Amino acid sequence: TIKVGINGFGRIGRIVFRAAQKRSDIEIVAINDLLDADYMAYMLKYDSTHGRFDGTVEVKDGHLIVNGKKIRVTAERDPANLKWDEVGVDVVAEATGLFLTDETARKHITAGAKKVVMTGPSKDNTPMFVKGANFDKYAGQDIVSNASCTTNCLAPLAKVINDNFGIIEGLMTTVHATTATQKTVDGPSHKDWRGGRGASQNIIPSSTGAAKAVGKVLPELNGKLTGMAFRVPTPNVSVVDLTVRLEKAATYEQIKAAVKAAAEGEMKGVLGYTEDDVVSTDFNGEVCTSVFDAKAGIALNDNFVKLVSWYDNETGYSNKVLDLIAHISK
Amino acid sequence: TIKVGINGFGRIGRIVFRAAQKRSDIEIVAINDLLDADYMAYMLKYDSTHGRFDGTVEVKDGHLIVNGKKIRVTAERDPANLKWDEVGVDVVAEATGLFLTDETARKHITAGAKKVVMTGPSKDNTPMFVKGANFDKYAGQDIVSNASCTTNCLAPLAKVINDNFGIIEGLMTTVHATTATQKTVDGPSHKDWRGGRGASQNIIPSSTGAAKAVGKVLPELNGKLTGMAFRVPTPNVSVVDLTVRLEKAATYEQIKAAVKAAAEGEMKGVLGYTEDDVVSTDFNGEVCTSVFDAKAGIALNDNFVKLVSWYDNETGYSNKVLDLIAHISK
Structure with a gap:
């Protein structure tokens, strides 16, 4: 399973989290955003648009236990101070809408992770890959955008x-x-x-x-x-x-x-x-x-x-x- | 002034009435619909979309008194018994959305009015005239539509x-x-x-x-x-x-x-x-x-x-x- 970390727990960040729950090939291990751990748990449990979280979520030791699995919770305004390697994070779902360039997003790799998937269109030359359009053109890049x-x-x-x-x-x-x-x-x-x-x-x-x-x-x-x-x-x-x-x-x-x-x-x-x-x-x-x-x-x-x-x-x-x-x- | 009478006091009928107020070439003398006179007055005084009626309006003997001028209120299901001649109505603003054909709309000429203007697209062959497109093509027809x-x-x-x-x-x-x-x-x-x-x-x-x-x-x-x-x-x-x-x-x-x-x-x-x-x-x-x-x-x-x-x-x-x-x- 690919170990994923989410940066930015906004709408995309939270739904990416929810949808990830039914997939075996992937696992969310950490979440970073300037939000208490118990606040994150609330924003996850209830959704005006998507209904109540279908599973278990609890706060223990300032971290989350979602569906029985522990989720490292942090809050760094800076992406380089994320110690992704500590939690063994392969790919980072850059969903804050703030770091949409190689320069800024690279800090995740700098911070210990392999690749970065921007959950928004690139602000620079970072490649954009859209399923059903050009996934076949992926050339091993480590920082990509999903448009x-x-x-x-x-x-x-x-x-x-x-x-x-x-x-x-x-x-x-x-x-x-x-x-x-x-x-x-x-x-x-x-x-x-x-x-x-x-x-x-x-x-x-x-x-x-x-x-x-x-x-x-x-x-x-x-x-x-x-x-x-x-x-x-x-x-x-x-x-x-x-x-x-x-x-x-x-x-x-x-x-x-x-x-x-x-x-x-x-x-x-x-x-x-x-x-x-x-x-x-x-x-x-x-x-x-x-x-x-x-x-x-x-x-x-x-x-x-x-x-x-x-x-x-x-x-x-x-x-x-x-x-x-x-x-x-x- | 062209004496007018409105049939159907829905959104169009009431707003046609409101805008007609500013025109000096036109006068609304009667309104027909299955509604009390005091209910009509309420629908006229208050509008969720266009605000409160700018002017006076009251009920005096099952009839309306808007900005002075008295309006003849009635409630006929069949246009033929409308006696427009009695109130001197030249043109009838057909706004019920129910009589969009010559045979049905003609029931107004029969009833005493000179001309008829459907406030919706014709359902038969009745001419459609849109200001800025073909108003100049009007040929005396007594029954027309405004699309x-x-x-x-x-x-x-x-x-x-x-x-x-x-x-x-x-x-x-x-x-x-x-x-x-x-x-x-x-x-x-x-x-x-x-x-x-x-x-x-x-x-x-x-x-x-x-x-x-x-x-x-x-x-x-x-x-x-x-x-x-x-x-x-x-x-x-x-x-x-x-x-x-x-x-x-x-x-x-x-x-x-x-x-x-x-x-x-x-x-x-x-x-x-x-x-x-x-x-x-x-x-x-x-x-x-x-x-x-x-x-x-x-x-x-x-x-x-x-x-x-x-x-x-x-x-x-x-x-x-x-x-x-x-x-x-x-």
Whole structure:
């Protein structure tokens, strides 16, 4: 089993923890964040969005005993003072959103661990690997990024579509659920004015690097797609609205079949497929990072279509982070 | 002044009434609906979305006294027994959403009114007129429709874009605010399963005629546009996300300039233009049916762009309904 340590017990940090519980190939051994041990236990036991932790969790000696296994708990504002080696940590799930560059994240290896998986997109040249898009391109790097929730949703779908009919050009919009980055009421956001407005009262036009980021994980699409977002008043689960221009004519039935095939083979577990009358809450807890909504999309013609794909921006992404930890441990 | 009478005192009926107050060319003399006069007054005095009625309103003998002028209250299930002539009603604002056909809507002419204006898309062949798109095509018809809030937003914008650079094809999406047809918690919606799901908990993919309806008001675009909707948990203010491929190449700066020009001239009052970091609540009360958001849209290249336009699905549409009453009366 790969020994994992989590840095930053935010939403991603905690769901990565929860999802890791059902996997045998991995084990969380330590958690670092500026939070008491008993506070961490509370944030783990109860989840407004995901329900009560399915298992046992207790505080003993300022550390955690989750599901009977001991979890080293620390609190270092600095990543180099983490003695990961002491707890025998192989990979570190960098989930604080603070150390998204080789320079900063390297300190984990400096601090005693082998590899670092950033739970966010790289701020520098650190490679981004997205399951179902380019895991096969992993070249043994020791510091990697798993991109963002949105890219993990769009990347797989874009690959299928591009690979089967060829994407000439595409523009996407993601109707994204509220995040911890937003505000309850009109607050301060110096680098993003719209982003500061009351989250629950508005449809907030936002930006996203996903589309372009996809051009990096699937270079063949570099410069081919771009997009934006719309933050809406929901606690979790978002949807990508991909409008593309196809090279090869393809009926909607042909696109539904190409996607369903991937969802059932090469991309099983990453890409999902559905023909049901689903809504966002029907995916809260969804592990597939991209679930194609057959009935939701619309084709104007065989070369201009609109595709719709769901994703639990929390559970899906978090599970894949663990898929990447396993992959680079292969 | 055109003497008007409202049938159906739902959201549209009450907001058409409210906005009608500022117009000197129009007067509301009667309202029909299965509701007491004192209940009507309550629905008029207080609005969760638009605040308290700006003016006086009271009940005197099962009839309303708003800002002085008396309003004739009634409660007929069959439009034919409405005696509009008795109160001198020239045009009837059909807002029950129940009589969207000539045979049913005509029941108003029969009952004493000169003309009828459906506050929703026709269900038969009744002409649809949208301000800024084809008000000039009106040919004396005594029964007309004002299309939907979405079409009143999408139509003006597509005309500017089409008229300047020519729309080869396009696919839109509207992130629409919750409406009265939705449910508070998972309820029944026989003709639309998705639409029955709890409004406040989901992003609900919904259908829309808007795009295909624009093909009717602006025939030149017939079969060239289509789209869908995403119903989000907000009380009011929606936005259209239009992705188009243009014939004549146009930089985003050329598109912003074409729209801004239309808004300051030929389409002043219908089309708006903003370069501010706005959100949906910034348009609650917006009279312009289509407000171009310059900073929100994005162009991939000079022939493929994503355009964003806001609209208060209540106040804007309601205002244009009165605009159509004044028009067909001119």
